[model samples]
Target chain A: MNCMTCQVTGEVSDDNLKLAGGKLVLSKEGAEQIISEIQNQLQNLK
Target chain B: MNCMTCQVTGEVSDDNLKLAGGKLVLSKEGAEQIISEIQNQLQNLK
Candidate 1:
């Protein structure tokens, strides 16, 4: 399988986030952080 | 912030899976594939 590794930074909107550019292979913690960040940002929309 | 780059492959179970090791940075397509694969596997449980 083809694979890649890189850092990803993105902007989160009310529903979905737009990935800026770069790559991301998330550690469990990293994934959690991203998820949490997205949710946190979206939650603020309420 | 700390960052890493590597490929990660793991088996998914009913709800979650244990991460073996290594690291990962995913392309958008890669992330989609992983999400689709997990959903696909989980759907098989039905």
Candidate 2:
């Protein structure tokens, strides 16, 4: 669930990221980084 | 909105992956291996 208190803290409004409790709860780049790792592990150990 | 890059990357934290910066950003099988492949897409077109 999206946080209720998330506030935009990025440089631009259009290309901004949200900061919740002073943390990057979710960044488009950060999230993307997270996805790639899984595919590799699944492909490996087989 | 999953990702333009997440063309593949299991796509679940506990269940799958972590992606980013043209590389895998997260993995669950193990810490070392998981950290290794967070990006670099090879999953293909349908």
Candidate 3:
């Protein structure tokens, strides 16, 4: 199973590894997306 | 308590809200931070 902090492998914020936007403010859309991504990652694990 | 997708109020990604280092990939560090942030947010809810 891929760990939560596992190395990502796609085009994104480049090494930011924090989250979308920048790690300062959070948007409702962003939050949902984060949840979705986490869910996706978890699925990939098991 | 802020839901998983609740709007964040700290310095972080703007609209991305996906996670550190960007989607498409994950890093141990990023995962840990994400977990930490989620944990923090969850704590706030209770």
Candidate 4:
């Protein structure tokens, strides 16, 4: 399965990643974790 | 049509949003924008 909303095909392996309909590649959980880390910084603006 | 690596279907409307294979929704360009916002913060951490 995958996180379809984000188009994350989820873990390919603990070391690798798969992506949207075969369009891109990223470090495993890299994008989501990066997004999460960033959102935490936005609290001051809220 | 979208940023496949992130599964972002991209712009939906100025007022509405769309999502992965039609799974979730957020403000227009919401996912990518949020991701970009967070990433920018990470660089500042270094």
Candidate that scores best on TM-score: 1
Q: Candidate 3 — number of clashing residue pairs? A: 31
Candidate 1 lDDT tens digits, B1-46: 6334322433223343222122444333434444444344435643
Q: Order candidates by DockQ, high to low.
A: 3, 1, 4, 2
Residue-level lDDT for A16 in candidate 2: 20
Q: How far is candidate 2 from the true structure (C-alpha RMSD, Å)?
A: 16.2
Question: Candidate 3: misplaced stretches above 4 Å?
Answer: A1-22, B1-46
Ranking by TM-score: 1, 3, 4, 2
Question: What are the RMSDs of all candidates, in order?
Answer: 12.4, 16.2, 10.5, 14.6
Q: Which digits, one per residue and each the tens of the lDDT, describe model 3 over residues A1-46? A: 7333344343233232434334533444455456556546644654
Give the top-scoring candidate (DockQ): 3
TM-score of 1: 0.30
TM-score against native, each model: 0.30, 0.24, 0.28, 0.25
- Model 4 deviation from the true structure expressed as Cα RMSD, one decimal place: 14.6
Evaluate model 3: give its TM-score.
0.28
Shift in Å, residue A44, candidate 3: 0.7
Model 4 chain B TM at: 0.37
The sequence of per-residue lDDT tens digits that candidate 1 reaches over residues A1-46 is 9323423422223333333232445433334344445445545665
The residue-by-residue lDDT of candidate 2 on B1-46, one tens digit each, is 5532323332323223322232212223232232333222223212
